[PDB]
Coordinates of all heavy atoms in Angstrom, one line a residue:
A1 N 9.2 2.7 -5.3 CA 10.5 3.3 -5.6 C 11.6 2.2 -5.8 O 12.5 2.4 -6.5 CB 10.9 4.2 -4.5
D2 N 11.4 1.1 -5.1 CA 12.3 -0.1 -5.2 C 11.8 -1.2 -6.2 O 12.2 -2.3 -6.1 CB 12.5 -0.7 -3.8 CG 11.2 -1.2 -3.1 OD1 10.2 -0.4 -3.1 OD2 11.3 -2.3 -2.5
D3 N 10.9 -0.8 -7.1 CA 10.4 -1.6 -8.2 C 9.6 -2.8 -7.9 O 9.5 -3.7 -8.7 CB 11.6 -1.9 -9.1 CG 12.3 -0.7 -9.6 OD1 11.6 0.2 -10.2 OD2 13.5 -0.5 -9.5
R4 N 8.9 -2.7 -6.8 CA 7.9 -3.8 -6.5 C 6.6 -3.4 -7.2 O 6.2 -2.2 -7.2 CB 7.6 -3.9 -5.0 CG 8.7 -4.5 -4.2 CD 8.4 -4.5 -2.7 NE 8.6 -3.2 -2.2 CZ 7.7 -2.4 -1.6 NH1 6.5 -2.8 -1.3 NH2 8.0 -1.1 -1.4
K5 N 6.0 -4.4 -7.9 CA 4.7 -4.2 -8.5 C 3.6 -4.7 -7.6 O 3.5 -5.9 -7.3 CB 4.6 -4.9 -9.8 CG 5.6 -4.3 -10.9 CD 5.5 -4.9 -12.2 CE 6.4 -4.3 -13.2 NZ 6.4 -5.0 -14.5
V6 N 2.8 -3.7 -7.0 CA 2.0 -4.0 -5.9 C 0.5 -3.6 -6.2 O 0.3 -2.8 -7.1 CB 2.5 -3.3 -4.6 CG1 3.9 -3.6 -4.3 CG2 2.3 -1.8 -4.6
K7 N -0.4 -4.2 -5.4 CA -1.8 -3.8 -5.4 C -2.0 -2.9 -4.1 O -1.7 -3.4 -3.0 CB -2.7 -5.0 -5.3 CG -2.6 -6.0 -6.4 CD -3.3 -5.5 -7.7 CE -2.9 -6.3 -8.8 NZ -3.5 -5.9 -10.1
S8 N -2.4 -1.7 -4.3 CA -2.5 -0.7 -3.2 C -3.9 -0.2 -3.0 O -4.7 -0.1 -3.9 CB -1.6 0.5 -3.6 OG -0.2 0.1 -3.5
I9 N -4.1 0.3 -1.7 CA -5.3 1.0 -1.4 C -4.9 1.9 -0.2 O -4.1 1.6 0.7 CB -6.4 0.0 -1.0 CG1 -7.8 0.7 -0.9 CG2 -6.1 -0.8 0.2 CD1 -9.0 -0.2 -0.9
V10 N -5.5 3.1 -0.3 CA -5.3 4.1 0.7 C -6.7 4.5 1.3 O -7.6 4.7 0.6 CB -4.6 5.4 0.1 CG1 -4.3 6.4 1.2 CG2 -3.3 5.0 -0.6
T11 N -6.7 4.7 2.6 CA -8.0 5.1 3.3 C -7.6 6.0 4.5 O -6.4 6.2 4.7 CB -8.8 3.8 3.8 OG1 -10.1 4.2 4.1 CG2 -8.1 3.1 4.9
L12 N -8.6 6.4 5.1 CA -8.5 7.2 6.4 C -9.0 6.3 7.5 O -10.1 5.7 7.4 CB -9.3 8.5 6.3 CG -8.6 9.6 5.6 CD1 -9.6 10.7 5.2 CD2 -7.4 10.2 6.4
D13 N -8.3 6.2 8.6 CA -8.6 5.3 9.7 C -8.2 6.1 11.0 O -7.0 6.2 11.2 CB -7.9 4.0 9.6 CG -8.1 3.0 10.8 OD1 -8.7 3.4 11.7 OD2 -7.6 1.9 10.7
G14 N -9.1 6.5 11.8 CA -8.7 7.2 13.0 C -8.0 8.5 12.7 O -7.2 9.0 13.5
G15 N -8.3 9.1 11.6 CA -7.6 10.3 11.1 C -6.3 10.1 10.5 O -5.6 11.1 10.1
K16 N -5.8 8.9 10.4 CA -4.5 8.6 9.8 C -4.8 8.2 8.3 O -5.7 7.5 8.0 CB -3.9 7.4 10.5 CG -3.6 7.7 12.0 CD -2.8 6.8 12.7 CE -2.5 7.1 14.2 NZ -1.3 6.4 14.8
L17 N -3.8 8.5 7.5 CA -3.9 8.1 6.1 C -3.1 6.7 6.0 O -1.9 6.7 6.2 CB -3.3 9.3 5.3 CG -3.4 9.1 3.8 CD1 -4.8 9.3 3.3 CD2 -2.5 10.0 3.1
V18 N -3.8 5.6 5.7 CA -3.3 4.3 5.8 C -3.2 3.8 4.3 O -4.2 3.6 3.7 CB -4.2 3.4 6.6 CG1 -3.6 1.9 6.6 CG2 -4.3 3.9 8.0
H19 N -1.9 3.5 4.0 CA -1.7 2.9 2.6 C -1.2 1.5 2.8 O -0.2 1.3 3.5 CB -0.6 3.8 2.0 CG -0.2 3.3 0.6 ND1 0.6 4.1 -0.1 CD2 -0.5 2.2 -0.1 CE1 0.8 3.6 -1.3 NE2 0.2 2.4 -1.3
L20 N -1.9 0.6 2.2 CA -1.6 -0.8 2.3 C -1.1 -1.3 0.9 O -1.9 -1.1 -0.1 CB -2.8 -1.6 2.7 CG -2.7 -3.2 2.7 CD1 -1.6 -3.7 3.6 CD2 -4.0 -3.8 3.0
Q21 N 0.0 -1.9 0.8 CA 0.5 -2.5 -0.4 C 0.6 -4.0 -0.3 O 1.1 -4.5 0.8 CB 2.0 -2.1 -0.7 CG 2.1 -0.5 -1.0 CD 3.5 0.0 -1.1 OE1 4.4 -0.7 -0.6 NE2 3.6 1.1 -1.7
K22 N 0.2 -4.8 -1.3 CA 0.1 -6.2 -1.3 C 0.8 -6.7 -2.6 O 0.6 -6.3 -3.7 CB -1.3 -6.8 -1.4 CG -2.1 -6.4 -0.3 CD -3.6 -6.7 -0.6 CE -4.5 -6.2 0.4 NZ -6.0 -6.4 0.0
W23 N 1.7 -7.7 -2.4 CA 2.4 -8.3 -3.6 C 3.0 -9.7 -3.1 O 3.5 -9.8 -2.0 CB 3.5 -7.5 -4.2 CG 4.8 -7.4 -3.4 CD1 5.9 -7.9 -3.7 CD2 4.9 -6.8 -2.0 NE1 6.8 -7.8 -2.7 CE2 6.2 -7.1 -1.6 CE3 4.1 -6.0 -1.2 CZ2 6.7 -6.6 -0.4 CZ3 4.6 -5.6 0.0 CH2 5.9 -5.9 0.4
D24 N 2.9 -10.7 -4.0 CA 3.5 -12.0 -3.7 C 3.1 -12.5 -2.3 O 3.8 -13.3 -1.7 CB 5.0 -11.9 -3.8 CG 5.5 -11.7 -5.2 OD1 4.8 -12.1 -6.2 OD2 6.5 -11.0 -5.4

């Protein structure tokens, strides 16, 4: 939303939906 261009992955971990973004 703030215009970062990121590499993302989403998974389930302990029943939680975990989204990790990586950039720079």
Side-chain angles (χ1 to χ4, degrees):
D2 59 319
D3 298 307
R4 290 173 284 116
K5 293 186 180 173
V6 309
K7 300 283 166 183
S8 289
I9 192 167
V10 183
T11 192
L12 281 163
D13 174 355
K16 302 190 180 200
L17 189 73
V18 176
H19 180 172
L20 173 62
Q21 296 175 337
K22 297 168 190 176
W23 72 107
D24 293 331

